[PDB]
Amino acid sequence: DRSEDARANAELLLKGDEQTHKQRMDIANILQSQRQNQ
Amino acid sequence: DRSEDARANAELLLKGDEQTHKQRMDIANILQSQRQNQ
Q: Chain A contacts of B37, Cβ < 8 Å?
A: 35-36
CA A22 to centroid of chain Cα atoms: 4
Q: Chain B contacts of A3, Cβ < 8 Å?
A: 1, 4-5, 8
Runs of H (alpha helix) within A1-38: 2-35
The coordinates were experimentally obtained by: X-ray
For A25, A33, A34, B30, the CA distances from A37, given in Å and listed in that order, are 18, 6, 5, 16
Q: Which long-range contacts (CB under 8 A, 24 or more apart) does B1-9 make?
A: B1/A3, B4/A3, B5/A3, B8/A3, B8/A6, B8/A7
